[PDB]
Scaffold this active site. Structure first.
Site, mmCIF file in Angstrom:
data_model
loop_
_atom_site.group_PDB
_atom_site.id
_atom_site.type_symbol
_atom_site.label_atom_id
_atom_site.label_comp_id
_atom_site.label_asym_id
_atom_site.label_seq_id
_atom_site.Cartn_x
_atom_site.Cartn_y
_atom_site.Cartn_z
ATOM 1 N N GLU C 215 0.829 -1.198 0.000
ATOM 2 C CA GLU C 215 0.000 0.000 0.000
ATOM 3 C C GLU C 215 0.869 1.255 0.000
ATOM 4 O OE1 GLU C 215 -1.769 -1.441 3.396
ATOM 5 O OE2 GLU C 215 -3.391 -2.530 2.399
ATOM 6 N N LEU C 310 10.529 29.117 -13.927
ATOM 7 C CA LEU C 310 9.509 30.104 -14.262
ATOM 8 C C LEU C 310 9.872 31.509 -13.792
ATOM 9 C CD1 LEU C 310 7.886 27.455 -14.818
ATOM 10 C CD2 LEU C 310 5.888 28.692 -13.943
ATOM 11 N N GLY C 336 9.899 9.744 6.223
ATOM 12 C CA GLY C 336 11.119 9.955 6.981
ATOM 13 C C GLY C 336 10.881 9.915 8.478
#
Ligand SMILES: [Ca+2]
Lengths: 358, 342, 350, 362
Positions: C215, C310, C336
């Site tokens: 999962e 950008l 983490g």
């Protein structure tokens, strides 16, 4: 705090650093978070900066300046940015980009007229270097049309140094000048509370006495300060890196416990070491370039070099700070990363190095 | 023209130029041969001595220059620039051995051992009577050292080559730093006079620790020299061979080089002020060493095929650079920062 | 868009990708900004996800599921997260964390009861992986709390773990003793409704007693989607920036593109491979952790690079580059210390 | 060794991997250090490679080949390079650069003539891409003049696929052709024992029957192989990374420092299998016939840079021993660097990808 290496810069600069630090801690740091959230500069700081004596660091004492150098100014920039990067940026555009431009390129009459109020903080200054703006001589006066984007202190600036095409000339603009207007301030990802906006000139009448240096010789006026001024602004990234360590070091102390995972302490110490080294290596490089500027030595490749180097280091160090705090990171580390990116936003260095060695 | 000026003063600028001119004429031509033969050119010791660079931080009363670690680091840099191997051997002699005797030796010990070390007649190394048994591995200048500073458990000792029970094993065959003679020290019932005890008995840890900082700072000149050598090769080659990506590569080499110099010089200058600190000493050598290795890879990259040929020195620069990197530095810095900020 | 390498995953998975992609483009992307701003999940999406048939990707077809694998589910997660990372996280917690847990560990009676409404989207699911359960004859009594639960405020069905040594339970919103706190206002993943679960003498039937790595691998699709979104922004921009007065900047921009492209597709290759390994039933403990760690960190750096590319335009709070950074950061936090676990596994195996 | 993730590639590829691995372990790995020291290829391996059936992995079975694909070949390259990077490189130039070129672009007569001895290992093959070489049609024959630098297997090659200018065309060259000569082999930083040299053509007479594909369409022959070449040769960096783990993992066992080592181990493991995942995927795409110009360049670029940095870390992990010529870590670094240089530098690879990506999204 013991993550600052001493560079033996002398009693006067160390006194300046300590003075600015105590001010920043008491008058800037508490409003750092609110400044970022509300996207507004606390205007009362301008007069306090003035009375602190830091708005004219490299300006002559005859106009109320400190008569110091770019190394001193870089460190003042550093300690202010350490408490708030946004406020640091606004401070830099005022005291360095605007004031030092008038200091270096202004006539005696221009200095006596504009500098005193800028250095005291009653007037706010700005610089619009980077053509979208054109100036046209019409007898006794100049007529300006065009626009300038992304100008720090734009909405609040009483005095502005602006570059326009004539091929290039610089002008001193007053807020009250007819034809001069400012658009709505930007809503930025970071450096929030550092008021940034568009300057708008529609048939703006500027007196000939407000021409900065020689007409058609604006690029050398741009080039003049740009190297030295850009080095002072490297203090921004330096301050942000300092702020990163301000967060991480006490955190590692709070987290050192018996219930702490078997190896997380030693990994935290290694992360601390890299942050410490990167921080002080950047300081060493920037300070050296700043000191070279004070000696009057050409620093074109290294000026650009130290800004580039430190800006990128600040961004990565901010990310490492976020990584280090994990789930627990309430903390200002998110803001530090967002702020750092603006400074980060090489061929010039390489091209000049190549051409010099032909 | 890839050197930034740090305004270090007239005397240091004079020393650099003196060392540079010597290195270019007397060291650089022998750089390739030293690496190939894996042998130090022994004639250089007396020449270094006559140059007056073997006792940079030694008192003028023993023939030293009476200068500081910043000056010594830069001498190390300019020598390593011509040959990293020879630079390493030079550093072990003038700093590891000589400066240890300078700082921790009694007046009689300095008067006896320093003059010949500074003149280049003796080679130095760092590792009623005392009896030392055991061994020490990875000692620079080991096979050739006439005088050796050795640490043992009781403490520091001054060892002479002619002492009974002292012997040296076969020199190492290393990936890089070839011609920097490294070997095992062997002690079998070695008789050492009590007069050869260095500093106070039981206070050897403070003697060892003291020099380590100065060593890390002065030897950081090694990586600095290697990076300088990288630029010495690449800059003329790119001209002989304008493109946009190469200029960016050049910029990174230039910036990394001068940033490394700035950090190392500052720490060295801090040592001269007496503001010496363990983590910044460890910090600047760690920093410069890692930068040197990566720049060497970039130097090889810039020359392309030619950079991968043993004819060109870029291969050697990579091999040499790696030794300076040879966890402990980062853990020392982190631990030290932590304890100061408790 | 041509920054996706083709991995030849077969007609069924490619059909799933295309279907979800077209849905995400029309039904998710337009509300992405509003979702982040309002910090509210658009509840109408649950039924739309259901009718799309993506809420039970790894669920049996007998209960309305697709009967597919973790590779397929990872890719559905990717394309949804590409349009909105927040909505992707909520979708993942429902269709993957909750549904697949009931699918894998639920009894036949439990599956027939809870899966159908979850797969249709009529019920919202959550997973809660400080909480104690005590057996008392016919019932279980739960006390304690669970923090930071996705879909928490809206969940009708929740899979919950408690201490006895550890057991799992199926919780219904209507259970006495079960309550939810005020939803969180987080820095990122805004619009993914998250709240505290509270259990005070919560009575759970014995029939609701139940029986993670696979999962966890599917959720790596989040960072993959975020990286995809980064390229979605940067690639058209580089075209716009290619101009007559430009500039040495163009060549450097293309090199930056190459790095992003490689990082993106290398991440996909690694994650997909681990996902396929999960479908084969092969142990992937160090590799599961490896690909989640790898892709999450890559996503954060690419979000920073998107902001860089950008420039000024990238630095306005209006644009989605800001959102990508905030979203990416949460996945790196949740993944983490992670590396030490992997190293420990390799060392002990050898 | 338990640092290899399984990619479920099927019984046939797994059988090939095991066969090559066991061979490499017994016949290649023991000779790796000596090969590097002597700067000489162990010539006995060519015939041994041939009987193993790995010199014609992607070659048709009608000429003695295995009739397998580029994924299989990449893994053969990997396991061989794992034991010795130098020997792996020579193997790659022979079995992929030369043999697969004749396989793909050769006429039935050309394949029947040259492939059997190359696949058996009786002949050594090479490829000369890089103009500097010109060819001029003279009735029945071609006359070649110029030179080709940096050719793997150059000094030993019996058969060479060579690209030349016509105003580009490809040719099959035999060592015995008049006018063809080779210079002294290179003294390189790494890949020592992989014989590399300059090819010299002085009025080299080549029969018209040895022209490869169509005259003037040599750029298409060159570009074709380069993609497949980059993917199979990417097995090189993969093998080197595998070799890094082969050294480091047992060494840490023999030896708060432990916790940092485990984190370093994890990074090596992840980088290795992520590289494999990417390279294998591109290779599988090649087998599907799916053109992947940017992805071919992408996976070799990625894996090559990863291998070099991992080699530095491997040296670091062994400490003093890692810096000794007795240990193989020094060699791995020296070997890895060539892949960043070779088959087009990292610069050319990034710009190829970026340029290709830009025009597709035009
Ligand atoms: Ca099915």
């Amino acid at each position: 705090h013991h993550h600052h290496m001493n560079f033996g810069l002398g009693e006067e600069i160390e006194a300046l650093r300590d003075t600015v630090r105590r001010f920043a801690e008491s008058r800037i740091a508490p409003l750092a978070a609110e400044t970022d959230r509300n996207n507004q500069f606390p205007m009362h700081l301008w007069r306090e900066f003035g009375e602190l004596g830091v708005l004219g660091i490299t300006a002559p004492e005859d106009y109320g300046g400190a008569g110091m150098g770019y190394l001193a100014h870089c460190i003042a920039m550093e300690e202010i940015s350490r408490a708030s990067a946004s406020i640091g940026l606004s401070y830099g555009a005022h005291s360095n980009l605007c004031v030092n431009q008038i200091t270096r390129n202004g006539s005696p009459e221009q200095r006596a007229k504009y500098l005193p109020k800028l250095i005291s903080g009653e007037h706010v200054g700005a610089l619009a270097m980077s053509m979208k703006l054109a100036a046209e001589k019409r007898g006794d006066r100049y007529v300006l049309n065009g626009n300038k984007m992304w100008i720090t202190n734009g909405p609040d600036a009483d005095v502005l140094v602006v570059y326009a095409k004539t091929g290039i000339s610089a002008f001193i603009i007053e807020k009250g000048f007819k034809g001069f207007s400012t658009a709505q301030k930007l809503d930025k990802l970071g450096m929030r509370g550092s008021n940034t906006c568009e300057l708008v000139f529609e048939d703006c009448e500027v007196p000939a006495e407000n021409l900065l240096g020689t007409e058609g010789k604006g690029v050398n006026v741009l080039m003049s300060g740009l190297d030295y001024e850009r080095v002072v602004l490297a203090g921004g990234p330096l301050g942000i890196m300092a702020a990163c360590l301000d967060v991480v070091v006490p955190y590692v102390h709070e987290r050192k416990q018996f219930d702490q995972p078997i190896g997380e302490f030693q990994l935290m110490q290694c992360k601390l070491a890299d942050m410490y080294v990167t921080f002080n290596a950047s300081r060493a490089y920037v300070y050296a370039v700043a000191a070279a500027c004070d000696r009057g030595e050409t620093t074109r490749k290294d000026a650009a070099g130290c800004i580039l180097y430190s800006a990128e280091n600040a961004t990565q160090m901010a990310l490492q700070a976020i990584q280090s705090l994990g789930g627990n990171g309430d903390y200002p580390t998110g803001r530090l990363l967002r702020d750092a990116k603006l400074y980060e936003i090489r061929m010039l260095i390489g091209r000049e190095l190549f051409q010099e060695t032909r």
